């Protein structure tokens, strides 16, 4: 059904389904099911309208999820770019932030390789 | 009453005790068929028996330690053929030509420096 | 290394996290087997001289 704000999981197990929501996955599913009282195993189709409700009125009113998360997280980063902060510069620049190496391997944070040339004579090794 | 053989395979040592009986084997305080549970080998550790006519004419209790159950399996396979020679020693006529009394001296090879895995040498670049 | 830098000898190092072994023999700071107090080479050299007891070459 429509468990969390503007979101809709279906037709696989409920615990796996709620993963499809933003601030939720396994860990928060195993919990919000045990605490809500629904068997984790049933397909989403087989949930009592009453059950979906006990789930939805819990999951929403107990956790920062979806947009409310991914917009505050984005603002949680603007804060670092707001002040002087290193990670802020490191966010502006677009490089690692967890103090990794950048000479090889920042490919995920940078994006695909922007290849350039060499010099005159040198090893083309 | 008693009959005995040792048996070894990759530092795995079985202790075999043959006794007149019904075929009910017991390894480490357990049924032979529920200690080697699911291992499709296992039934292969008795091959000296079903090849000199034994099996259910005999019973066997067994101490085993060191290694992993397949070595433990082969070390039994030996230990029985040994105890079975401590019986009628003529058990060799049609027992030795089949192997059984041999001791597979194949052992894990030493890890050597400059290689990853004794023989697996490190790969390289520009020759 | 520099004879000056030989001062792990310097008993008080303010805090232990500045304390660092050197080879008692050659002063190397970089392969000091705790047991012996020797570095990689000093270890091998003395071993061959037979000056550190009960140490053979291992073969297995």
């Amino acid at each position: 059904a429509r468990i969390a704000g503007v979101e809709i999981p279906r037709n696989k197990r409920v615990d796996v389904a709620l993963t499809y929501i933003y601030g939720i996955g396994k860990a928060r599913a195993k919990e919000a099911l045990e605490k809500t009282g629904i068997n984790p195993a049933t397909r989403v189709k087989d949930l009592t309208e009453a059950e979906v409700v006990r789930l939805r009125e819990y999951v929403e009113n107990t956790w920062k999820l979806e947009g409310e998360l991914r917009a505050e997280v984005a603002a949680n980063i603007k804060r670092l770019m707001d002040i002087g902060c290193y990670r802020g510069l490191r966010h502006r620049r677009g490089l690692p932030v967890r103090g990794q190496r950048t000479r090889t391997n920042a490919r995920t944070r940078k994006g695909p390789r922007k290849t350039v040339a060499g010099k005159k004579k040198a090893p083309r090794k | 009453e008693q009959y005995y053989g040792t048996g070894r395979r990759k530092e795995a040592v079985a202790r075999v005790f043959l006794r007149p009986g019904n075929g009910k084997v017991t390894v480490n305080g357990q049924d032979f068929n529920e200690y080697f549970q699911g291992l499709v080998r296992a039934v292969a550790a008795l091959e000296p028996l079903r090849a000199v006519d034994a099996l259910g004419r005999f019973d066997a209790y067994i101490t085993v330690r060191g290694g992993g159950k397949s070595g433990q399996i082969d070390a039994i396979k030996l230990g029985i053929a040994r105890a079975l020679v401590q019986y009628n020693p003529d058990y060799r006529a049609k027992l030795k030509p089949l192997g059984f009394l041999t001791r597979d001296a194949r052992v894990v090879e030493r890890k050597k420096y400059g290689k990853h895995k004794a023989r697996r040498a490190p790969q390289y670049s520009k020759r | 290394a520099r004879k000056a830098l030989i001062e792990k000898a310097k008993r008080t190092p303010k805090f232990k996290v500045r304390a660092y072994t050197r080879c008692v023999r050659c002063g190397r700071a970089r392969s000091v087997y705790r047991f012996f107090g020797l570095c990689r080479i000093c270890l091998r050299e003395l071993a061959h001289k037979g000056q550190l007891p009960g140490v053979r070459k291992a073969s297995w």
Partner: protein
């Protein structure tokens, strides 16, 4: 770049250890250091005695020390003199009540270390390298020995392009553990750099 140490190679057999004790992990470290400290002293103030090996046994505070010299005059001194100063020179550093037995070397030219030094001593004095060596070997051969070999490294004759000089007679079966092949090395500090001197002496099988 080849060749292991003919002593260290044979250590289990033919040739035994120089230091000779036992010690837990909390001990060995500074204990062994001491042993070397004693060896270090036992060459500065003991050079001219012509010393081969400094054995060092040990029980709990019965640190042996058993200096092997060819000329046990200079070790003992005039009367029993020099060996009194040194026994209490080993007490200044090692607080562990030491001995200092001294066993003479019967035939110095059958112990490689000594041989090796005589050759090095000759060269530090300016001398005939290529001759000195063949001499040094003949001595080790006229003194018995089933064979012997001596090597001086390079900058031979105060030269320019380092060399390596040879000379070897009889058998020197470097690959066999049933050997007994003394090995000694002497430095030879000269006017123009060092020169390594190795000596080998084969004396009998089993």
């Amino acid at each position: 770049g080849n060749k292991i140490h003919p002593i260290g190679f044979r250590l289990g057999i033919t040739r035994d250890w120089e230091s000779r004790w036992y010690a837990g992990k909390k001990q060995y470290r500074h204990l062994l250091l001491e042993d070397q400290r004693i060896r270090g002293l036992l060459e500065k103030e003991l050079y001219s005695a012509g010393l081969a090996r400094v054995d060092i046994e040990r029980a709990a505070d019965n640190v042996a020390v058993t200096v092997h010299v060819a000329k046990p005059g200079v070790v003992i001194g005039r009367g029993g003199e020099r060996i009194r100063v040194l026994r209490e020179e080993l007490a200044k550093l090692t607080g562990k009540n030491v001995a200092l037995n001294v066993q003479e070397v019967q035939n110095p030219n059958l112990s490689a270390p000594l041989v090796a030094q005589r050759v090095a001593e000759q060269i530090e004095r300016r001398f005939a390298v290529r001759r000195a060596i063949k001499q040094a070997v003949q001595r080790v051969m006229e003194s018995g020995a089933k064979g012997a070999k001596v090597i001086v490294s390079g900058r031979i004759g105060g030269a320019e392009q380092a060399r390596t000089e040879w000379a070897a007679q009889g058998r020197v079966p470097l690959h066999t553990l049933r050997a007994n092949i003394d090995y000694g090395f002497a430095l030879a500090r000269t006017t123009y750099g060092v020169l390594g001197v190795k000596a080998y002496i084969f004396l009998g099988e089993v």
